[PDB]
């Protein structure tokens, strides 16, 4: 009765054991129920098909503001943090986002409390309070959220595009909103934002525009009754789905050139083509077909040629979402110094490639290759995490029939050459939009974008330029991709070996290498993870060598790109990056052809021949990259400085770029052989592989290095790890710096506890679990210090402690006092909490720590974490949780009194203050809860001096793991 329809069989992958049931409630809400008797966390998500695009013209950000307010209380549950508190006490988490056409809410929680969480959740769409007091506070959270984006190049460009299209089209709206648009201007215009929020929620949060997805251990029938009981009561206003048939870019918006001044020193070219909404053609995705070809990076591609000419390093092409009724097709690239001087030529090449596609006509074998690949990917798809899974499904239930939601955006069906020609016919000079981003335009622009202040200039593209592009002929350098040879064919799951182990086992332990191995015994998918850590002191010995290690690997990946792109498309991936201890290499994906790719990579790194041009280009990009860090957010700088202050050896960005200029091709070529001459390899091979195969891969890596690099074993005494600085009892240091880009402050407070150990770990983690929710509700919700308010444990070099991070317009010393006041409030709150509440927290942590991985890479990452930290505690979770359950409320109080309290005898505190741009100075020390009086801190003026004047902690001892 309350149900209008129960969908047929929900097409799923045969490897998927979860159960699905699709249905449509009488109110129009589309639902997808998911039963998983094994899930440790249950989850729900609801997506309302309306967003910022529906904001009233005079109240920018209203829909986003509504999203924030829905968390602050409902008639059934008044407490403004009843929702977040409930989830916190039950190992849950929640978040939501607002797009142009969607507002998505989601959460996860212990599988035992799905109903209680879902009940509180459903009230968001039934009886929101939109409390006046909450409204006046949370508006600051929205403003702060916008504030951090103001100096973000991505957002500036995002809003600039909107500002250059039809001013009458809702696409031009500012969706984030801020204090001005949500409070100041409305008050001046005599508008009641409270009413407007209610009016907005009332008019658009209709059941006919809602989709829900629930996942839990309960059966489909029980989940059906749960959902019907909590959502069938949502009212249906039969609201029409907003449509946007007229494209934001009309004739007068075409053949336009935009010159933009970025905040960071970046060089980019954006080419955009207005196109019809292609959503309904999803069965054949003509837009993705053209993106696949245009954005391809293999031999013969547009990228390959643009890179060879030394004009660009990266490229992305394909369709870009707009909204119901309109989309875009883009071709974006970064620019080298020379590329910036040849923009017209680059675009010409772009049209020559497009002309090549027209001349060859749609290629069915290409479509088929992707189709078969997507079929393989869907079949062996990794099991997703509940929260993200429900959120995603809730969103696509709006575009595909119930039975197709799982396969919709995965499987390709019919080849439609006619639709492809239709889209391709839109990629012409006469309907192109070009935007160039570069600091070279500074002082040369004449327009300012109102919301972000972006400096730019608009010009019509000369007809003679358009005409030359229209006459783009064929370029012999452009060819269609060749058949992908990395496509996997062997998907057999090797039978579990008789001596297989539940945790990684040390099957090789020599001076040259230490091999950890584990055959997958849970997922049974034709995939594997091959992780290799290459140790060498010459990777971080000094700034110069750090730069060379980076440059070397960056150049190696750049030369392997054409070759590796195909592998990537075939689900075979790899990551190679320099570390403070050497190099990191990870190959993941289908095990079938992993050996081929791995061998190629090792062979290449040991016989690598640097290309001078590529070298100069990448070095130049690296220099800007280091300099661009000055444009990062305050809290990012705070974390950066703390890291530099607390680690034994750490080269600063400034030291790195100062040494960069001395990096020459000759020196780099000499560097490589030296780096590979001596190494130690610690690996972790995990997945659909056998012990002998594992030993086989390791031997191949070694043999390749030995044969081409003459690599020899490193000395054990050379295998040095860095220590963390040891702070003195009752000590308090403050490091202060200014952020020259953002006009907001940032701060990080670090309360060092002690070396990591079962007891110390759980003391800290339990306490963090207990203060987690209260910290956010106090410093942000109540006090509204900023959008970014974070607390939690900090682990580094075997040491650990409590950390607080905040980004606010308020000065650091004031922020410091607030955090200190909060600590006093927590103390009191803990002494008064009931055993019932306390035990609830212990259980909350227990579930969080015991939540099991859903995919191979997640399980592997945990093992890798134990190997990298060199603690090798593979059964850590069971042990620590067992110990956790014995902690009492008294233990936590003592821990707080001896380590964290303001007058704690073993308090170890350091604070990093990052001042706002407009702040010339600021003290380091200074209704609302009462803040305690603090001591005079020692101001750090030189990081080197600071570290030198303090002792260093020892390194953690390895949890012995005996094996061959």
């Amino acid at each position: 009765p309350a149900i209008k329809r129960i969908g047929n069989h929900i097409t799923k992958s045969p490897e998927d054991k979860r159960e699905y049931r699709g249905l449509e409630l009488a109110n129009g809400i589309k639902v997808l129920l998911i039963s998983d008797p094994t899930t440790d966390k249950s989850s729900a998500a609801l997506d309302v098909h309306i967003g910022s695009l529906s904001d009233p013209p005079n109240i920018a950000g209203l829909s986003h503001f509504c999203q924030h307010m829905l968390f602050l209380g409902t008639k059934k549950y008044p407490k403004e943090n009843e929702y977040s508190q409930f989830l916190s006490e039950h190992a849950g988490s929640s978040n939501a986002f607002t797009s142009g056409e969607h507002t998505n809410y989601y959460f996860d929680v212990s599988h035992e409390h799905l109903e209680g969480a879902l009940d509180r959740f459903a009230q968001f769409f039934l009886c929101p309070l939109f409390d006046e007091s909450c409204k006046d506070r949370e508006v600051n959270a929205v403003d702060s959220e916008h504030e951090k984006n103001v100096m973000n190049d991505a957002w500036r460009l995002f809003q600039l595009e909107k500002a250059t299209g039809n001013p009458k089209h809702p696409f031009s709206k500012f969706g984030t909103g801020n204090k001005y648009t949500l409070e100041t201007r409305p008050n001046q215009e005599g508008i009641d934002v409270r009413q407007e929020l209610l009016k907005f929620h009332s008019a658009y949060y209709s059941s006919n525009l809602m989709a829900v997805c629930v996942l839990g251990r309960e059966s489909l029938d029980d989940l059906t009754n749960l959902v019907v009981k909590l959502f069938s009561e949502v009212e249906n206003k039969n609201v029409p789905l907003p449509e946007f048939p007229e494209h934001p870019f009309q004739e007068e918006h075409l053949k336009q050139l935009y010159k933009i001044v970025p905040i960071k020193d970046i060089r980019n070219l954006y080419v955009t083509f207005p196109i019809p909404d292609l959503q309904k053609y999803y069965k054949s995705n003509p837009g993705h077909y053209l993106g696949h070809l245009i954005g391809h990076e293999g031999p013969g591609s547009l990228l390959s040629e643009l890179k060879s000419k030394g004009w660009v390093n990266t490229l992305v092409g394909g369709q870009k979402e707009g909204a119901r009724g309109f989309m875009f097709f883009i071709i974006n690239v970064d620019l080298t110094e020379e590329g910036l001087l040849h923009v017209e030529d680059i675009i010409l090449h772009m049209f020559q490639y497009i002309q090549k596609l027209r001349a060859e006509g749609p290629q069915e074998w290409v479509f088929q290759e992707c189709k078969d690949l997507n079929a393989v990917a869907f079949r062996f798809k990794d099991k997703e995490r509940p929260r993200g899974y429900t959120s995603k499904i809730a969103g696509i239930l709006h575009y595909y029939p119930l039975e197709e939601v799982l396969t919709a955006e995965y499987l390709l069906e019919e080849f439609r050459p006619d639709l492809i020609e239709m889209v391709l016919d839109k990629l012409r000079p006469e309907n192109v939009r070009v935007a160039i981003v570069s600091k070279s335009f500074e002082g040369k622009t004449d327009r300012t974008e109102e919301w972000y202040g972006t400096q730019y200039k608009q010009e019509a593209i000369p007809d003679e330029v358009i005409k030359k592009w229209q006459n783009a002929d064929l370029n012999g350098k452009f060819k269609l991709p060749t058949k992908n040879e990395f496509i996997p064919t062997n998907f057999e799951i090797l039978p579990l070996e008789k001596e297989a182990t539940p945790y990684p086992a040390l099957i090789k332990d020599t001076a040259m290498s230490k091999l950890w191995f584990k055959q997958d015994d849970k997922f049974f998918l034709p995939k594997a993870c091959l992780n290799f850590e290459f140790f060498s002191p010459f990777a971080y010995v000094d700034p110069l060598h750090c730069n060379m290690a980076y440059l070397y690997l960056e150049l190696l990946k750049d030369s392997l790109n054409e070759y590796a792109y195909a592998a990537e498309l075939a689900g075979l991936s790899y990551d190679l990056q320099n570390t403070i201890y050497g190099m990191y290499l990870s190959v993941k994906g289908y095990n079938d052809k992993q050996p081929i790719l791995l061998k190629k990579i090792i062979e290449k790194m040991a016989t690598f021949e640097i290309d001078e041009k590529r070298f100069e280009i990448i070095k130049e990009a690296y220099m800007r990259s280091l300099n661009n860090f000055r444009a990062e957010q305050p809290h990012q700088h705070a974390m950066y400085y703390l890291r530099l202050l607390m680690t034994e050896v750490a080269w600063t960005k400034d030291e790195l770029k100062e040494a960069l200029d001395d990096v020459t091709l000759p020196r780099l070529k000499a560097f490589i052989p030296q780096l590979l001459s001596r190494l130690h390899i610690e690996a972790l091979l995990h997945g659909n592989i056998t012990k002998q195969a594992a030993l086989g891969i390791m031997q191949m890596v070694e043999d390749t290095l030995i044969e081409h690099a003459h690599t020899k074993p490193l000395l054990p005494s050379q295998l040095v790890r860095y220590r963390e600085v040891q702070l003195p009892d009752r000590g308090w240091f403050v490091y202060q710096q200014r952020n020259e880009v953002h006009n907001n402050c940032g701060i990080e407070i670090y309360y060092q506890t002690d070396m990591q150990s079962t007891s110390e770990n759980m003391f800290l983690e339990l306490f963090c679990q207990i203060i987690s929710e209260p910290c956010f509700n106090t410093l942000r919700t109540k006090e509204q210090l900023g959008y970014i308010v974070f607390s939690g444990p900090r682990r580094a070099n075997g040491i650990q402690g409590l950390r607080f991070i905040i980004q606010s317009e308020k000065p650091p010393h004031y922020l410091e006092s607030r955090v200190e006041a909060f600590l006093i409030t927590m103390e009191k709150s803990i002494e008064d909490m009931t055993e019932e509440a306390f035990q609830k927290h212990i259980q909350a942590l227990a579930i969080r720590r015991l939540d099991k991985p859903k995919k191979l890479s997640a399980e592997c990452a945990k093992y890798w974490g134990e190997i990298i930290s060199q603690q090798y505690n593979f059964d850590r979770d069971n042990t620590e949780v067992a110990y956790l359950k014995t902690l009492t409320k008294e233990d936590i109080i003592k821990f707080y009194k001896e380590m964290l309290a303001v007058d704690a005898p073993r308090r170890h505190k350091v604070s990093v203050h990052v001042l706002a741009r407009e702040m010339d100075s600021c003290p380091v020390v200074g209704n609302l809860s009462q803040a305690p009086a603090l001591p005079q801190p020692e101001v750090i003026q030189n990081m080197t001096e600071f570290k030198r004047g303090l002792p260093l902690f020892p390194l953690v001892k390895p949890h012995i793991n005996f094996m061959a």
Partner: peptide, 18 residues
């Protein structure tokens, strides 16, 4: 590579290094 709208969140859940 192939392209595969900036959207606003309620909270940042992990703080990160960057």
């Amino acid at each position: 590579f192939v392209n595969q709208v900036e959207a606003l969140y309620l909270v940042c859940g992990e703080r990160g290094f960057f």
